[PDB]
């Protein structure tokens, strides 16, 4: 029954809608459910790319996340830990990170580390004194102009979209 007719929504009493909702629930209970609907497999089969190193890392992170989510749900249900923050905390705990804090000089610091810090500072000084003053204002102006034009364009796109929706609703009201 492919040509599902457009039944005029206002004529049917709501009691028949609630009874149909119950009947559809009953039949949906009788339907055996596969974990993915057969139709969706065609879409998902397009996702399969090459096994790049990144894909292995992101798969690993997501799998370990799923394991920690399960174990936390098993331990403490009250934590309104947003999934994002939990993922980030796990990634920070497991994987080695750039530690800039080692650059803070201390009296106990080795001369080697002090000399590294001094060289970093000297380069930063030269950039701030000689380079950034000439360009930063221009960069900010250019970025602001580009963004302003982008905003204008996206607002015009929003207007054109609302117009398309309205024009289509008019067409649907002429049928």
């Amino acid at each position: 029954m492919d040509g599902l007719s457009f039944v005029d929504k206002g004529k049917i009493p709501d009691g028949y809608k609630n009874e149909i909702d119950q009947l559809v629930k009953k039949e949906f209970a009788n339907i055996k459910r596969e974990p993915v609907h057969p139709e969706i497999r065609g879409i998902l089969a397009k996702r399969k790319g090459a096994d790049n190193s990144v894909s292995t890392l992101t798969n690993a992170l997501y799998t370990e996340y799923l394991k920690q989510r399960n174990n936390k749900k098993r331990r403490t249900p009250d934590f309104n830990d947003d999934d994002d923050t939990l993922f980030l905390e796990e990634y920070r705990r497991k994987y080695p990170r750039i530690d800039t804090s080692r650059y803070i000089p201390n009296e106990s610091s080795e001369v080697s580390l002090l000399g590294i810090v001094d060289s970093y500072l000297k380069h930063q000084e030269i950039v701030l004194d000689t380079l950034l003053p000439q360009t930063v204002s221009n960069q900010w102006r250019i970025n602001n102009d580009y963004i302003r034009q982008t905003c204008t364009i996206v607002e015009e796109m929003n207007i054109q979209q609302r117009k398309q929706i309205n024009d289509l609703e008019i067409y649907r009201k002429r049928l």
Partner: protein, 132 residues
């Protein structure tokens, strides 16, 4: 105009003739090497079909001023390394969010599809009983 893959300003902009869309040269060339197809239409696309766009000097200034660490007065090599790590973190978080969303949506879609098929069945059954 942003690369239709990264959502950033392309450092080397190229046009796919199949989708008539702008991409970052590296990203489009890699996608074509991996798939032989246009990323938008999935039509077949070779590297030799890609039309590289010639940037005007103003486009160069735009590319270097947009999304550049040189916009901020805390510019330094340690700060660059930290910003890089932070962007990697944000991208990993985004990838996680994408996966979690796709899983949830797959489950919701499957549910609504079984509901639709059940509804179609109920409608057919009612029409059959009414015609007996």
């Amino acid at each position: 105009m942003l690369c239709a893959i990264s959502g950033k300003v392309p450092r080397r902009p190229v046009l796919s003739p199949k989708s008539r869309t702008i991409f970052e040269k590296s990203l489009l060339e890699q996608y074509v090497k991996d798939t032989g197809n246009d990323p938008i239409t999935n039509e077949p696309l070779s590297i030799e079909e890609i039309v590289e766009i010639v940037p005007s000097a103003q486009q160069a200034s735009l590319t270097e001023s947009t999304n550049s660490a040189t916009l901020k007065a805390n510019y330094s090599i340690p700060n660059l390394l930290t910003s890089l790590q932070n962007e990697w973190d944000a991208i990993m978080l985004e990838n996680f969010k994408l996966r979690s969303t796709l899983d949830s949506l797959t489950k919701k879609l499957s549910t609504v599809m079984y509901e639709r098929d059940a509804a179609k069945l109920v409608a057919a059954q009612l029409l059959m009983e009414k015609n007996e």
